[PDB]
Amino acid sequence: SRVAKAPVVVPAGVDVKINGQVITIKGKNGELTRTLNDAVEVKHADNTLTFGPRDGYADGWAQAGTARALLNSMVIGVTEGFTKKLQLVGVGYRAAVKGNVINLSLGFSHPVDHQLPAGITAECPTQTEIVLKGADKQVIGQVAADLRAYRRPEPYKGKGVRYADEVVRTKEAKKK
Amino acid sequence: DRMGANFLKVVNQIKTRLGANPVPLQLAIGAEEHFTGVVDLVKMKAINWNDADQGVTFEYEDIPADMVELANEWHQNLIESAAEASEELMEKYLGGEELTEAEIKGALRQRVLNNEIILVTCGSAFKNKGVQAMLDAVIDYLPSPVDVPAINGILDDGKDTPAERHASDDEPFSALAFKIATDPFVGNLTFFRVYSGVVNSGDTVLNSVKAARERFGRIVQMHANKREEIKEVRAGDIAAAIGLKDVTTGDTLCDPDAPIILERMEFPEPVISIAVEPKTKADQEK
Amino acid sequence: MKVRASVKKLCRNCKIVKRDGVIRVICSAEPKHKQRQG
Amino acid sequence: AKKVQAYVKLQVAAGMANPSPPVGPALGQQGVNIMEFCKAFNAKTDSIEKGLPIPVVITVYADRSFTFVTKTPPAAVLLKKAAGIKSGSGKPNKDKVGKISRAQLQEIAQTKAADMTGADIEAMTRSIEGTARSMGLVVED
RNA sequence: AGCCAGGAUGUUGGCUUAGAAGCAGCCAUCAUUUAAAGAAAGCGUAAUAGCUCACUGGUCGAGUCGGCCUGCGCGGAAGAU
């Protein structure tokens, strides 16, 4: 397949701990482990990692096809990182980072300050731009999408919290 | 006292959209909710306001320590604004003669008769934060009826001789007719303003642009609402030139054998036209 | 999500994936083109 | 010459100084002073009797620059400049009015031969016969 | 199937020209170059600038694609101690 024609090359600076089904990757700034399913046959062969679908679970081409895409992201996420910037377009809406906490100037009668978990070093260059930094590809989206779900992109003004690369489709009033 | 209310943005937005040259004076102290000081920059003094009272204090102090450098970089642009207003302050911006509070306004007041700079002030009307501050600039940056070019009655049709008349009481009388409201007591009313001269009570005030004779009744002043009968109208009051038989937009209110204005500029056009219809047939009679 | 018995691939870029078993059709810019039953 | 940034050939009769609203956007693409494209071409526009759409192309450059290529008017409007009316295509294969022979077509092709490297003489001859049949025009020599 | 990737360019494609300027719609429906391009599919839109389909022109470097017939499966499927 395309995934079978896709092996991943681990570089120096990220150590694997192959206890069979449980792999804990000792990396640069974290520990990106995934306890996969038993539809995989893993082997860090020489340097480039090779994998395999186990018999019986012949649908493990899917279940390890996740894994081939997975561990490639893990060895490049623990070292380099993800810049996940969000664009705050709100009338009187600010963003400021302190410790691991983000403020949410969100047009309410009360402030919303939610604490953010490990795997996050957040920053804020201004009141409308907010950095998020992380090692797992999941955690760099999950903490980002929760903020965006508190104020979705409003398609009559362009109001809302929105991603850096995301482009909304704002409409027009057309009646009054 | 609102979110998104950046003072330095808006005054420096005029230089982009309106294309003007504003140099502001009274700056901002406070993060818009704990806001307590308005930074007057000539005297370099912050003003305390009421805890929540409708108007107790006016307590002036120094520049606070949390804005000791933004007062530094903005005062040096204030004292620029007289070296390029008058040519005489050009050589003491660079020589280093002291630019006091009293010296700089003598140049900038003459920068209001040409109007290249406007004077800006941040504060709250409703939170009683700035209103007591805003009054002292009016006597020093807004012009007086005796400091301006006064009544200038030209002629009639003979020759274009524009004549600056006197702003004192030593002239023929002159006024103008505007804001001519109505009432179910006397009928027609006015909100007129006299520029110079004194009128007594009872006069043959004409309207010399449309050739009509009127007589000057019982003049009444207001608190914008309440009838207070102003008998003797001094030069500069605003009152109600009552009992005008016919009066148009902006004609003169002047005794004969005197200078005369004839001026109506920019007569508008009411555009949207809706047709009113009566309810009863007794209504169309009224 | 409008519901009707017919999922007809209507918009020009209409994805179809079987989430939970019930089909719901995924457009990009048109929210109006998204049905769910059938 | 250039690539995916910008390349559109649109200009109509150069007697009109103000950019016509539909032409506007091809000048409204990469930030021009519209007075510059009015002052570029008028030094040579006084060598013509105006009335035909003359074409130019636009092509762009990095900072605020731009460029343009001058050619001669096309033979498609030269077919309907001599024929009197500017629009004859009402029914292509049902109208038989109006003859011009090949000799007129090549002398409006030498001004193509002295201007451009494509639109060659003998190859365009059937398409200058092809713009005749769609308009409902006849040709004999 | 994606990243580079030109969207080779005669033309204004008429009519009726107010814009119906490939993108409102009826008749033509040729193509100057054909290793890549149609007098044309939508969005941007009064018109177009923006973004593509067109051939994937160069890279990956193997399989892949749209329908016909049947074995079964899912949705359709909401009722009253």
XYZ file of C-alpha atoms (C1' of nucleotides) in Angstrom:
722
model
C 0.000 0.000 0.000
C 0.946 3.655 0.277
C 1.290 3.191 4.021
C 3.290 -0.007 3.453
C 5.487 2.090 1.139
C 5.888 4.573 4.028
C 8.467 3.717 6.685
C 9.497 6.297 9.260
C 13.117 7.232 10.021
C 13.814 7.941 13.693
C 16.763 10.337 14.105
C 19.304 10.664 16.884
C 17.874 12.467 19.895
C 14.699 10.423 20.443
C 14.894 7.014 22.147
C 12.317 4.239 21.803
C 11.426 1.735 24.554
C 10.073 -1.308 22.720
C 8.318 -3.447 25.315
C 6.293 -4.969 22.498
C 2.798 -3.469 22.447
C 3.763 -0.588 24.758
C 6.200 1.909 23.263
C 7.300 4.885 25.345
C 9.335 7.339 23.262
C 12.027 9.155 25.253
C 12.404 12.386 23.328
C 13.704 15.936 23.587
C 11.247 17.729 25.872
C 8.682 15.059 26.765
C 7.565 11.425 26.651
C 5.241 10.729 23.713
C 3.910 7.217 24.309
C 1.045 5.424 22.611
C -0.249 2.052 23.743
C -1.374 0.817 20.342
C -3.738 -1.998 19.452
C -2.676 -5.611 18.857
C -3.083 -5.225 15.098
C 0.546 -4.143 14.710
C 3.980 -5.783 14.360
C 6.544 -3.155 15.369
C 10.300 -3.281 14.756
C 12.877 -0.492 14.870
C 14.852 -2.426 12.272
C 18.117 -0.562 11.753
C 17.310 3.140 12.058
C 14.196 3.487 9.884
C 11.219 1.987 11.667
C 9.339 -0.822 9.937
C 5.876 -2.061 10.902
C 3.453 -4.840 10.047
C -0.194 -5.907 10.230
C -0.821 -8.939 12.430
C -2.741 -11.940 11.113
C -6.398 -12.283 12.051
C -6.623 -8.494 12.233
C -6.268 -8.060 8.486
C -8.060 -4.727 9.000
C -4.895 -3.771 10.908
C -3.613 -2.163 7.719
C -5.968 0.550 8.898
C -5.107 0.090 12.575
C -1.374 0.323 11.935
C -1.913 2.789 9.103
C -2.864 5.105 11.926
C 0.351 4.085 13.689
C 2.684 4.814 10.761
C 1.315 8.341 10.620
C 1.285 8.491 14.416
C 4.873 7.883 15.485
C 6.250 10.044 12.662
C 4.453 12.985 14.242
C 5.626 12.023 17.725
C 9.349 12.092 17.009
C 9.019 15.464 15.286
C 6.654 16.909 17.884
C 8.712 16.281 21.017
C 11.689 18.090 19.466
C 10.525 20.857 17.136
C 6.963 21.585 18.217
C 3.728 23.091 16.935
C 2.978 26.781 16.586
C -0.794 26.941 17.037
C -1.811 30.596 16.846
C -5.387 31.791 17.271
C -6.900 35.062 16.099
C -9.185 36.869 18.556
C -11.563 39.146 16.658
C -13.947 40.455 19.321
C -15.085 43.945 20.354
C -13.080 44.568 23.492
C -11.553 41.100 23.581
C -8.089 40.496 24.982
C -5.666 37.642 25.612
C -2.842 37.527 28.152
C -0.721 34.652 29.438
C 0.345 34.135 33.046
C 1.973 30.894 34.157
C -0.168 28.262 32.466
C -3.436 30.225 32.626
C -5.223 32.098 29.834
C -7.719 34.894 30.391
C -10.865 35.020 28.277
C -12.280 38.502 27.720
C -15.429 36.975 26.233
C -18.246 39.494 26.639
C -19.642 37.960 29.813
C -20.701 39.297 33.184
C -17.841 37.332 34.773
C -14.229 36.485 33.812
C -13.277 33.042 32.496
C -9.780 31.905 33.499
C -9.178 28.225 32.745
C -5.960 26.429 33.699
C -4.252 24.531 30.923
C -2.626 21.089 31.337
C 0.888 19.763 30.846
C 2.323 19.685 27.371
C 1.406 23.365 27.008
C 3.678 26.423 27.092
C 1.272 29.179 26.059
C 2.200 32.718 24.995
C 0.465 35.926 23.912
C 2.241 38.559 21.788
C -0.843 40.772 21.931
C -4.473 40.854 23.017
C -5.637 39.234 19.768
C -2.825 36.751 19.033
C -2.060 33.781 21.290
C 0.616 31.163 20.925
C 0.212 27.567 21.999
C 3.208 25.222 22.101
C 3.121 21.457 22.586
C 4.501 18.023 21.795
C 1.512 15.793 20.959
C -0.483 16.655 17.867
C -3.689 15.823 19.746
C -3.019 18.091 22.730
C -2.022 20.994 20.519
C -5.510 20.941 19.035
C -7.698 19.833 21.957
C -6.846 22.793 24.162
C -7.139 25.074 21.124
C -10.545 23.877 19.962
C -12.098 24.321 23.391
C -11.505 28.078 23.291
C -12.839 28.311 19.740
C -15.975 26.427 20.791
C -16.707 29.074 23.421
C -17.129 31.692 20.708
C -17.564 30.146 17.271
C -16.947 32.228 14.105
C -20.026 34.383 13.624
C -21.014 34.463 9.949
C -22.658 37.875 9.931
C -19.768 40.022 11.117
C -16.754 37.765 11.254
C -16.963 37.861 15.059
C -15.549 35.041 17.134
C -12.375 33.228 18.007
C -10.724 31.618 14.999
C -7.481 29.917 14.034
C -4.504 31.517 12.302
C -4.950 29.608 9.027
C -8.746 29.267 9.216
C -10.777 31.456 6.861
C -14.440 32.004 7.751
C -17.319 32.615 5.368
C -19.094 35.762 6.512
C -22.455 36.593 4.946
C -24.497 39.776 4.511
C -27.698 40.917 6.252
C -29.735 41.389 3.023
C -33.047 42.276 4.740
C -32.413 45.064 7.268
C -14.633 53.824 30.646
C -15.299 51.111 28.073
C -13.506 48.146 26.575
C -11.502 48.752 23.421
C -11.219 52.469 24.245
C -7.629 53.308 23.326
C -7.078 57.069 23.565
C -3.800 57.125 21.645
C -5.260 55.062 18.807
C -8.150 57.389 17.943
C -6.192 60.656 18.001
C -3.558 58.946 15.866
C -6.345 57.624 13.624
C -7.282 61.168 12.597
C -3.876 61.525 10.916
C -4.824 58.523 8.739
C -8.509 58.950 7.889
C -9.335 62.607 8.493
C -5.799 63.618 7.485
C -5.613 66.363 10.110
C -2.868 67.218 12.632
C -4.063 66.550 16.197
C -1.601 66.972 19.071
C -3.458 65.831 22.218
C -2.927 67.184 25.707
C -4.915 65.382 28.419
C -3.782 61.746 28.403
C -4.945 58.646 30.265
C -4.196 56.903 33.574
C -5.916 53.643 34.458
C -6.850 50.379 32.736
C -10.346 51.720 31.936
C -12.081 50.207 34.982
C -9.822 51.380 37.800
C -9.470 54.632 35.848
C -8.741 57.558 38.168
C -6.438 60.073 36.436
C -6.525 62.224 33.316
C -3.033 63.333 32.371
C -2.944 67.059 31.689
C 0.461 67.549 30.146
C 1.011 71.327 30.213
C 0.936 71.534 34.025
C 1.980 67.824 34.235
C -0.699 67.097 36.831
C -3.100 64.184 37.267
C -6.560 64.867 38.677
C -8.342 62.715 41.247
C -12.090 62.315 40.762
C -15.057 61.266 42.849
C -15.100 57.842 44.516
C -18.582 57.493 42.942
C -20.050 60.900 43.982
C -21.738 63.155 41.403
C -18.927 65.741 41.960
C -16.730 66.187 45.043
C -12.992 66.332 44.421
C -10.552 67.990 42.016
C -7.380 66.799 43.720
C -4.316 67.550 41.603
C -1.140 65.543 42.167
C 2.010 64.812 40.193
C 2.423 62.344 37.331
C 2.109 58.836 38.820
C 5.047 56.465 38.763
C 3.333 53.934 36.501
C 3.466 56.382 33.572
C 6.698 58.321 34.164
C 8.129 57.676 30.687
C 5.030 58.012 28.488
C 4.611 61.464 30.013
C 8.242 62.082 29.022
C 7.939 61.124 25.353
C 4.604 62.902 24.901
C 5.423 66.201 26.616
C 8.304 66.692 24.184
C 5.782 66.610 21.318
C 3.560 69.131 23.111
C 6.388 71.643 23.301
C 7.140 70.995 19.640
C 3.664 72.368 18.861
C 4.642 76.036 19.413
C 7.942 76.078 17.494
C 6.008 75.283 14.283
C 2.991 77.423 15.288
C 4.854 80.721 15.672
C 8.289 81.306 14.164
C 9.549 82.864 17.407
C 9.327 79.657 19.458
C 11.512 77.908 16.864
C 14.778 79.124 18.386
C 13.910 78.349 21.997
C 12.866 74.751 21.374
C 16.495 74.190 20.351
C 18.160 76.813 22.543
C 16.464 75.504 25.647
C 14.509 78.392 27.101
C 11.894 76.943 29.445
C 8.552 76.062 27.832
C 6.147 76.906 30.627
C 2.428 76.270 30.894
C 1.551 79.917 30.290
C 3.948 80.642 27.427
C 2.926 77.823 25.077
C -0.796 78.639 25.044
C -0.134 82.163 23.764
C 1.039 80.641 20.510
C -1.510 77.808 20.370
C -4.529 80.078 20.888
C -3.538 81.792 17.650
C -3.452 78.274 16.189
C -7.241 78.121 16.631
C -7.978 81.115 14.361
C -6.587 79.133 11.401
C -7.579 75.656 12.731
C -4.773 73.302 11.799
C -4.720 71.492 15.181
C -7.635 70.437 17.387
C -7.315 69.926 21.139
C -8.357 66.499 22.440
C -9.286 65.289 25.945
C -10.148 61.822 27.241
C -12.546 61.196 30.096
C -16.035 60.179 31.133
C -19.151 62.293 31.100
C -21.346 59.821 32.946
C -18.769 58.622 35.487
C -18.016 62.296 36.397
C -14.406 61.907 35.228
C -13.238 64.790 33.054
C -16.211 67.168 32.995
C -14.737 69.433 35.657
C -11.449 69.143 33.781
C -12.901 70.047 30.385
C -14.059 73.566 31.268
C -10.704 75.327 31.674
C -9.678 74.680 28.065
C -12.809 76.418 26.760
C -11.646 79.780 28.088
C -8.191 79.188 26.577
C -8.671 77.138 23.382
C -12.206 78.039 22.198
C -12.648 81.589 20.862
C -14.694 84.425 22.437
C -17.098 86.700 20.509
C -14.766 89.669 21.152
C -11.579 87.795 20.189
C -12.966 86.658 16.812
C -13.651 88.728 13.721
C -17.016 90.176 14.740
C -20.160 91.078 12.780
C -19.137 91.870 9.206
C -22.066 93.527 7.428
C -21.072 94.040 3.746
C -23.569 96.410 2.005
C -26.608 95.637 -0.247
C -25.736 95.801 -4.001
C -23.598 98.968 -4.499
C -20.032 97.724 -3.794
C -18.326 94.730 -2.082
C -16.986 96.494 1.047
C -16.878 93.959 3.911
C -16.813 95.997 7.130
C -15.588 94.533 10.428
C -17.881 96.063 12.993
C -17.217 96.300 16.732
C -17.801 93.451 19.170
C -18.599 95.875 22.003
C -21.751 97.768 22.968
C -20.654 100.798 20.885
C -22.131 99.677 17.536
C -25.480 99.627 15.777
C -27.469 96.601 16.900
C -27.179 93.279 15.066
C -28.409 89.702 15.458
C -29.453 86.678 13.419
C -32.554 84.489 13.304
C -32.236 80.716 13.709
C -33.755 77.768 15.611
C -37.148 79.364 15.288
C -39.370 77.039 17.311
C -43.102 77.197 18.016
C -45.453 77.187 20.990
C -49.210 77.190 21.681
C -48.826 80.313 23.866
C -47.538 83.073 21.550
C -47.215 81.111 18.309
C -43.752 81.618 16.870
C -40.626 81.584 19.027
C -36.917 81.910 18.291
C -33.599 80.768 19.742
C -31.594 83.766 18.515
C -28.143 84.964 19.556
C -27.025 88.598 19.552
C -23.399 89.163 18.582
C -22.889 92.736 19.807
C -24.892 95.791 20.808
C -27.677 96.175 23.360
C -31.423 96.269 22.717
C -34.067 97.638 25.033
C -37.525 96.113 25.497
C -39.870 97.080 22.676
C -38.342 97.849 19.293
C -39.182 98.087 15.603
C -36.874 95.215 14.729
C -37.178 94.537 11.013
C -35.994 91.673 8.817
C -34.142 93.731 6.243
C -33.601 90.961 3.669
C -37.283 90.390 2.850
C -38.810 93.894 3.407
C -41.155 93.328 6.354
C -41.975 95.267 9.518
C -42.064 93.585 12.928
C -42.219 94.787 16.545
C -40.173 93.407 19.442
C -42.323 91.869 22.181
C -41.584 90.259 25.557
C -38.297 88.365 25.235
C -37.933 85.162 27.273
C -34.818 83.170 28.255
C -34.670 79.505 29.248
C -32.801 76.841 31.150
C -33.463 75.137 27.763
C -36.983 74.478 29.157
C -38.420 77.079 31.556
C -39.866 80.502 30.735
C -37.714 83.285 32.196
C -38.547 86.724 30.811
C -35.331 88.448 29.687
C -36.094 92.153 29.436
C -32.723 93.761 28.764
C -30.731 91.678 26.269
C -27.000 92.288 26.585
C -24.425 91.764 23.846
C -23.860 88.024 23.655
C -26.905 86.478 25.297
C -29.135 83.885 23.621
C -32.874 84.419 23.936
C -36.207 84.400 22.089
C -36.799 87.229 19.607
C -40.535 86.958 20.089
C -43.404 88.332 18.028
C -41.848 88.296 14.546
C -44.640 88.520 11.972
C -42.633 86.801 9.252
C -39.072 85.510 9.646
C -36.881 83.313 7.451
C -33.687 81.323 7.860
C -30.817 83.572 8.899
C -31.970 87.098 8.123
C -31.041 90.137 10.139
C -32.604 91.427 13.349
C -31.576 95.053 13.044
C -32.738 98.622 13.579
C -32.816 100.786 10.433
C -30.132 103.364 9.587
C -27.561 100.680 10.414
C -25.407 98.032 8.682
C -27.369 95.274 6.980
C -26.692 91.609 6.192
C -28.145 89.668 3.239
C -26.895 86.111 3.524
C -28.496 82.704 3.039
C -25.956 80.016 2.140
C -26.607 76.269 1.672
C -30.367 76.000 1.556
C -30.890 72.224 1.913
C -33.114 69.732 0.106
C -35.353 67.433 2.155
C -35.225 64.299 -0.007
C -37.551 61.525 1.207
C -41.184 62.309 0.426
C -44.104 60.565 2.135
C -47.760 61.556 1.650
C -49.822 62.073 4.804
C -53.572 61.400 4.616
C -56.275 62.422 7.127
C -58.418 60.096 9.212
C -61.779 61.881 9.181
C -62.861 64.470 6.666
C -62.931 66.933 9.566
C -59.199 66.258 9.891
C -58.181 67.510 6.434
C -59.670 70.870 7.389
C -57.130 70.875 10.207
C -28.731 18.721 10.409
C -31.811 18.304 8.281
C -33.250 14.790 8.213
C -34.825 13.018 5.235
C -34.787 9.484 3.896
C -32.752 10.391 0.813
C -29.096 11.263 0.949
C -28.440 12.494 -2.574
C -24.962 13.811 -3.332
C -26.027 17.332 -4.132
C -23.285 19.960 -3.749
C -20.283 19.724 -6.081
C -17.845 19.011 -3.250
C -19.934 16.783 -1.007
C -18.106 14.308 1.220
C -19.875 11.161 2.387
C -18.657 9.257 5.457
C -20.588 6.876 7.700
C -20.373 8.320 11.190
C -22.085 5.998 13.753
C -23.889 4.177 10.903
C -26.294 6.920 9.920
C -25.003 8.728 6.856
C -24.461 12.465 7.087
C -23.081 14.274 4.038
C -20.267 16.823 4.373
C -20.063 19.936 2.187
C -17.480 22.656 2.638
C -19.025 26.097 2.384
C -22.744 25.235 2.262
C -24.329 24.211 5.559
C -27.622 23.864 3.683
C -26.447 20.782 1.806
C -26.128 18.471 4.838
C -28.699 15.705 5.402
C -28.785 12.892 7.961
C -30.769 9.644 7.646
C -30.981 6.894 5.068
C 7.079 36.128 -19.936
C 5.804 36.030 -16.364
C 3.772 33.500 -14.407
C 0.874 32.880 -11.957
C 0.949 36.450 -10.515
C -0.797 38.312 -13.380
C -1.308 38.157 -17.165
C -4.475 39.585 -18.810
C -4.690 41.287 -22.220
C -7.475 43.869 -22.020
C -7.653 47.323 -23.567
C -10.453 48.873 -25.649
C -10.482 52.039 -27.879
C -7.940 54.530 -26.537
C -9.995 57.664 -27.147
C -11.433 57.226 -23.644
C -8.917 58.421 -21.015
C -10.796 57.219 -17.864
C -10.443 53.391 -17.405
C -13.873 51.936 -18.425
C -15.481 50.163 -15.355
C -15.008 46.485 -16.665
C -11.362 47.282 -17.727
C -10.839 48.947 -14.281
C -10.012 45.627 -12.404
C -7.186 44.641 -14.804
C -5.758 47.978 -13.641
C -7.124 47.172 -10.171
C -4.864 44.159 -9.617
C -1.398 45.217 -8.423
C -1.675 48.834 -7.222
C -1.198 51.244 -10.097
C -1.457 54.978 -10.258
C -4.127 54.981 -12.980
C -2.733 58.306 -14.207
C 0.477 56.481 -15.199
C -1.223 54.167 -17.693
C -3.037 57.227 -19.040
C 0.258 59.077 -19.524
C 2.229 56.118 -20.919
C 0.245 55.424 -24.082
C -0.946 58.875 -25.206
C 2.434 59.795 -26.711
C 1.713 57.279 -29.485
C -2.113 57.496 -29.500
C -1.826 60.757 -31.482
C -0.740 58.712 -34.505
C -4.231 57.204 -35.014
C -7.825 58.049 -35.871
C -9.605 56.588 -32.854
C -12.596 54.256 -32.999
C -11.200 50.728 -32.863
C -10.396 48.738 -29.715
C -6.595 48.638 -29.494
C -5.237 45.935 -27.130
C -2.520 46.020 -24.475
C -1.476 43.369 -21.951
C -0.526 43.945 -18.306
C 2.412 42.234 -16.562
C 3.665 42.915 -13.056
C 6.762 43.187 -10.846
C 7.626 42.958 -7.128
C 7.491 46.292 -5.301
C 5.031 48.692 -6.991
C 6.158 48.212 -10.570
C 4.339 46.933 -13.649
C 4.848 46.705 -17.407
C 2.805 46.534 -20.616
C 3.253 45.462 -24.253
C 1.996 47.524 -27.197
C 0.700 45.720 -30.283
C -1.552 46.606 -33.219
C -5.390 46.295 -33.277
C -6.596 42.775 -34.105
C -8.007 41.678 -37.431
C -11.312 40.648 -35.818
C -12.342 44.286 -35.393
C -10.623 45.090 -38.695
C -13.128 42.774 -40.382
C -16.008 44.870 -39.025
C -14.302 48.262 -39.351
C -14.319 48.082 -43.162
C -17.716 46.319 -43.271
C -19.350 49.354 -41.619
C -21.221 47.660 -38.758
C -19.379 46.479 -35.659
C -21.671 43.476 -34.942
C -22.857 41.246 -37.779
C -23.057 37.824 -36.140
C -26.810 37.289 -35.856
C -26.991 34.046 -37.834
C -23.648 32.581 -38.998
C -24.635 30.114 -41.728
C -27.781 31.902 -42.893
C -26.470 35.366 -43.803
C -24.608 36.018 -47.103
C -23.702 39.753 -47.151
C -20.374 41.509 -47.642
C -17.163 40.561 -49.462
C -13.481 41.285 -48.825
C -10.779 39.296 -50.613
C -7.533 37.895 -49.222
C -5.485 40.932 -50.315
C -7.062 43.109 -47.619
C -6.476 40.309 -45.111
C -2.733 40.062 -45.718
C -2.143 43.824 -45.614
C -3.791 43.847 -42.198
C -1.506 40.887 -41.495
C 1.739 42.645 -42.425
C 0.941 45.012 -39.561
C 0.667 41.798 -37.576
C 3.884 40.581 -39.216
C 5.602 43.824 -38.262
C 4.289 43.577 -34.656
C 3.923 40.001 -33.380
C 5.612 36.599 -33.696
C 2.412 34.567 -33.514
C -0.757 35.304 -35.485
C 1.121 34.463 -38.671
C -0.040 35.259 -42.213
C -1.085 31.965 -43.781
C -2.380 30.293 -40.613
C -4.706 33.143 -39.593
C -6.062 33.306 -43.174
C -8.625 30.587 -42.520
C -9.497 32.139 -39.139
C -9.916 35.511 -40.794
C -12.082 33.384 -43.053
C -13.464 31.804 -39.873
C -14.490 35.090 -38.294
C -16.265 35.847 -41.580
C -18.505 32.749 -41.571
C -19.600 33.214 -37.952
C -20.608 36.809 -38.727
C -22.425 35.711 -41.882
C -20.014 37.206 -44.405
C -18.850 36.048 -47.845
C -15.362 35.909 -49.366
C -14.190 35.625 -52.979
C -10.987 36.539 -54.803
C -3.957 11.431 -4.782
C -0.925 15.832 -2.942
C 3.717 20.168 -2.956
C 6.089 23.025 -6.913
C 2.488 24.269 -11.453
C 1.769 27.497 -16.259
C -3.786 28.343 -15.784
C 0.377 28.902 -23.297
C -2.764 33.360 -25.291
C -5.916 35.639 -30.913
C -11.144 38.418 -28.233
C -14.071 43.205 -26.654
C -16.657 36.811 -28.481
C -21.221 39.435 -30.647
C -26.096 40.573 -30.381
C -29.058 44.909 -27.821
C -23.126 46.626 -26.299
C -26.090 50.442 -20.295
C -22.413 45.558 -17.993
C -25.518 41.641 -20.479
C -16.517 41.878 -21.496
C -15.238 32.952 -21.247
C -18.857 33.456 -15.869
C -27.540 36.295 -17.819
C -29.221 33.893 -22.061
C -29.991 32.255 -27.623
C -27.155 31.142 -32.834
C -21.989 29.860 -34.303
C -19.215 26.246 -31.644
C -12.467 28.591 -35.814
C -8.624 28.259 -33.444
C -2.865 31.600 -34.823
C 1.246 26.985 -30.934
C -0.840 22.208 -30.473
C 5.137 18.213 -24.937
C 0.021 22.266 -21.343
C -5.264 25.259 -22.716
C -12.031 25.353 -24.059
C -14.721 31.109 -28.455
C -15.566 27.459 -21.379
C -18.352 24.596 -14.979
C -19.131 27.211 -10.253
C -17.674 30.551 -6.803
C -15.520 36.486 -6.632
C -19.713 39.394 -9.106
C -23.094 45.342 -12.224
C -18.204 43.794 -14.738
C -14.003 41.864 -13.470
C -9.224 41.608 -9.889
C -9.142 36.571 -6.275
C -9.642 30.763 -6.552
C -9.930 26.264 -9.977
C -11.622 22.472 -13.787
C -9.268 21.847 -17.992
C -3.283 18.632 -19.804
C -1.101 17.337 -14.555
C 4.261 20.255 -18.416
C 7.933 18.599 -14.035
C 8.199 14.990 -9.047
C 6.450 10.096 -6.391
C 7.608 5.543 -8.860
C 3.220 1.309 -8.100
C -1.447 -0.351 -9.240
C -5.699 2.263 -9.927
C -10.859 3.756 -11.684
C -16.337 4.223 -13.042
C -20.443 1.477 -13.773
C -23.601 -3.928 -14.804
C -25.134 -8.709 -12.099
C -25.844 -11.467 -7.604
C -24.635 -13.237 -1.412
C -25.876 -11.125 2.421
C -25.826 -6.344 5.873
C -27.198 -0.362 7.629
C -30.472 3.523 7.422
C -36.108 3.976 6.455
C -38.255 1.629 11.876
C -42.584 6.240 16.515
C -47.099 4.239 21.034
C -49.651 3.581 24.835
C -49.837 -0.809 33.833
